[PDB]
């Protein structure tokens, strides 16, 4: 798994994994600000584009 924004896979305890696909994102690369790893489901922007 690699971060969509910065393209690195380091600091994996900070690295969110998408519940709809194999993609990821560091909480510190997310905008708007994300202080912590959320408890519930997280969907990347590519999965959001499939919603209705
Ligand atoms: Zn990143
Ligand atoms: Zn996704």
């Amino acid at each position: 798994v690699t971060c969509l924004v910065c393209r690195k896979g380091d600091n994996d305890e900070f690295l969110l994994l998408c519940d709809g696909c194999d993609r990821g994102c560091h909480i510190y690369c997310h905008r708007p600000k994300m202080e912590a790893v959320p408890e519930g489901d997280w969907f990347c922007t590519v999965c959001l584009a499939q919603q209705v």
Side-chain angles (χ1 to χ4, degrees):
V1 175
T2 279
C3 173
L4 292 171
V5 179
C6 74
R7 305 278 135 191
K8 307 182 180 183
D10 55 5
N11 296 137
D12 54 300
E13 302 90 345
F14 290 88
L15 182 60
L16 300 180
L17 314 180
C18 178
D19 292 305
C21 75
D22 71 329
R23 284 164 185 94
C25 185
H26 293 114
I27 65 177
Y28 54 79
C29 298
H30 202 278
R31 299 294 183 276
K33 179 180 72 178
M34 192 179 277
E35 271 181 327
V37 174
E39 285 285 325
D41 292 337
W42 179 77
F43 292 98
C44 80
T45 49
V46 179
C47 292
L48 284 181
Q50 299 294 100
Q51 294 185 357
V52 81

